[PDB]
């Protein structure tokens with residue numbers, strides 16, 4: 300297991316998200332579904348010139364899986380997946396400018412809900428989660444697990460759990476007072492409100 304420091308600017312963003320009073324927390328789900336949709340768009344496009352890229356799975360979709368026993372909400376997609384370089388360095392490089400822009404906007408009076416316009420919507424996960432685990436598999440790279448409970452650091456390791464084929468699984472370990480996001484009615488409501496027109500099937504799993 301390797302441990303890394305977030306860039307200062309990203310740690311700052313995460314602290315703001317965690318510490319600011321903001322009741323409209325439900326937007327985290329729109330942001331993560333948006334990221335999944337983007338990753339799905341990417342594998343779809345790439346497959347047009349190289350059909351073999353779908354050898355690791357032809358179906359392009361998003362699954363939402365609540366688990367009250369584990370207090371987790373999992374978002375699974377079969378998008379392009381992230382590489383080790385994506386996880387450790389490259390996405391963060393991009394996230395630095397996006398964060399700076401977002402912070403300046405919040406000063407100009409913007410609100411947290413516009414976070415996605417700056418390409419850093421993932422971090423809105425920390426509105427509802429005490430820990431986030433991201434399992435991801437890109438073609439021709441290994442399956443990795445990224446994890447952070449904030450506090451300035453994240454970890455990356457090669458994942459030895461069940462193989463995914465291709466794509467990304469975001470596991471939100473919810474805060475004790477945010478369990479409403481495990482309720483079927485509530486998830487349906489949020490998807491209908493914010494993610495109505497996503498161009499991939501979204502399947503909301505029900506609990507046993």
Ligand SMILES: COc1ccc(-c2c(-c3cc(Cl)c(O)cc3O)noc2NC(=O)C(C)C)cc1
Nearest residue numbers: 331334335337338341378379380381421467469
């Ligand atoms: C907006 O920034 C983004 C950065 C990366 C990704 C992404 C994901 C992914 C990531 C998160 Cl956090 C998620 O919840 C769901 C996902 O499927 N998997 O592969 C990816 N690679 C790309 O999309 C490349 C064009 C870089 C999506 C959006």
